[PDB]
Amino acid sequence: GSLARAGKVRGQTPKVAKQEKKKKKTGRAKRRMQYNRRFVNVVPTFGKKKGPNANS
């Protein structure tokens, strides 16, 4: 077929730049952070919505 469209959407996309945030965490302190998020001080709250990264 016609090869003329190649990289159409890759070059058509509006170029948004990545926003600067802090250095994340690494290693044992990251595992401590995600253990503290999920297990100790889990929220007595709207259960069965146990879908972190729930949009709305």
Binding site: G47, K48, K50
Partner: peptide
């Protein structure tokens, strides 16, 4: 409501996602 969204969209393209969400609601932790 996962019940209604499953009972409506079990047939559509979003069936696997609403079944995932319904089992999440039913089983729970």
């Amino acid at each position: 409501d996962p019940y209604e969204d499953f009972q409506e969209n079990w047939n559509t393209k979003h069936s696997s996602g609403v079944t995932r969400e319904l089992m999440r609601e039913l089983n729970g932790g």
